[PDB]
């Protein structure tokens, strides 16, 4: 298997404008949404057909109840945070928990918090400690590090529980997640500003979104200014990207263990 990751985000919004939920929680396996919940629907729902088909109603009923309690917990932590900062109005609170299964079989786990879209607290599961960005974050950390059983629970969840969930979801969503759509790559040449030639290397129709694109000069790295286009979703499960240079030249593309060269 390629590298895969499972992530769960939480977004808490104080004093929300009409049409904005107070709480959102979405789960992801790689780029794919898998679960959703908001303070408006108050229901845990699948966001992938392979999640709906393989997880029995009891799973949705159970997570609906946990998310209702997590919603309450988040509303209260955000109030305590605002009080610590002497802040009023609309502020945001976010959490990201997750894990990665790498190709070589090793694993990673991360758990972090953000206040107003900025880094606030970062868990270090190897020293069982929290890294605080300021005095307010430091006050919270001091309380969270007093509960040694919670720290141990978090480590166990990140290392064992998250990996086991991810391995389950990778099997459920096998036909989506473990598939390969090779890229369609073309090099376009054009005389731009008088005496300047622009080389564009464009790729599309590829899955997974992880691609390596680089321009080379006579076999070795081009110590010039390369422009890179974002890996953008095409809307059909596949992606697109590009790389450009100015003026022997060859575009190099790596996708799912296949290397491609496009000589000019």
């Amino acid at each position, epitope marked *: 298997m390629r590298t895969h990751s499972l992530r769960y985000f939480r977004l808490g919004v104080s004093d929300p404008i009409h049409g904005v939920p107070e709480f959102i929680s979405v789960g992801y396996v790689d780029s794919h949404p898998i679960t959703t919940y908001d303070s408006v629907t108050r229901q845990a729902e699948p966001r992938a057909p392979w999640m709906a088909e393989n997880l029995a109603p009891d*799973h949705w009923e159970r997570y609906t109840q*946990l998310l*209702r309690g997590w919603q309450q917990m988040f509303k209260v932590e955000l109030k305590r945070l605002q009080r610590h900062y002497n802040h009023s109005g609309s502020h945001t609170y976010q959490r990201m928990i997750g894990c990665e299964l790498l190709e070589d079989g090793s694993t990673t786990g991360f758990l972090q918090y953000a206040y107003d879209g900025q880094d606030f607290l970062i868990f270090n599961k190897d020293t069982l400690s929290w890294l605080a960005v300021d005095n307010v974050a430091h006050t919270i950390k001091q309380a969270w590090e007093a509960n040694q059983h919670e720290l141990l629970y978090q480590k*166990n969840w990140l290392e064992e*529980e998250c990996i086991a969930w991810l391995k389950r979801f990778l099997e459920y969503g096998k036909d989506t997640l473990q598939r390969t759509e090779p890229p369609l790559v073309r090099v376009n040449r054009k005389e731009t500003f008088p005496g300047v030639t622009a080389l564009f290397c464009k790729a599309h129709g590829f899955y997974p979104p992880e691609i390596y694109m680089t321009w080379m000069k006579n076999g070795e790295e081009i110590v010039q200014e390369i422009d890179y286009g974002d890996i953008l979703p095409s809307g059909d499960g596949t992606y697109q990207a590009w790389a450009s240079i100015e003026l022997l030249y060859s575009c190099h593309v790596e996708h799912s263990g296949v290397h491609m060269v496009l000589q000019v």
Partner: antibody
Amino acid sequence: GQNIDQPTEMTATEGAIVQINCTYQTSGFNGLFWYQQHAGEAPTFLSYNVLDGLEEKGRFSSFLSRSKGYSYLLLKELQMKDSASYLCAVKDSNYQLIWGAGTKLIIKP
Amino acid sequence: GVTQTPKFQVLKTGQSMTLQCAQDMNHNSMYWYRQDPGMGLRLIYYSASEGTTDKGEVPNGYNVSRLNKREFSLRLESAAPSQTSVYFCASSVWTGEGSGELFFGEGSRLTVLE
């Protein structure tokens, strides 16, 4: 989670040692708990274990082997007051508690 | 810090009953268990936080009300002899948390007779 097993009854002598075992077969693991329940009273928390090792709270010790799917509650220097039931509970993947039928411990003076 | 009432109660089949439970510990999660000889505690209903409740392992014959953060009452609509048991109420700070222990009430000994 599906099943938790612990012996129905255990008898040991006062001043000695007793080990109450708990085996679990669950779908996910987020921790094992031990409760002490005196006859006619409410259960009271004794210990929590989620990672491998042995934790000691006086004469009481709790051990967890996440690989063997087992735990034990160890009682040292047995006193007559330790005559009680010992309940074993495991939190599954979905954070739901799975309870064992309990172990009644009888101390011989 | 959990207070449950009544400690004892005799009921006639078809009679209604409400069991009371309060905690002054600022806990969000509340549970109603029944203890029957030869088996582990069986969850009737639980309340993960204020504003929500759900069925447990054995909800038939019961209903619950999470009145506020402090109180969670258990109701027996039409008492039945199989409902003769020892009932326990419990609270924990949160659910969806691994380490957080249960705090039990003193228990309610209920007898149902024809």
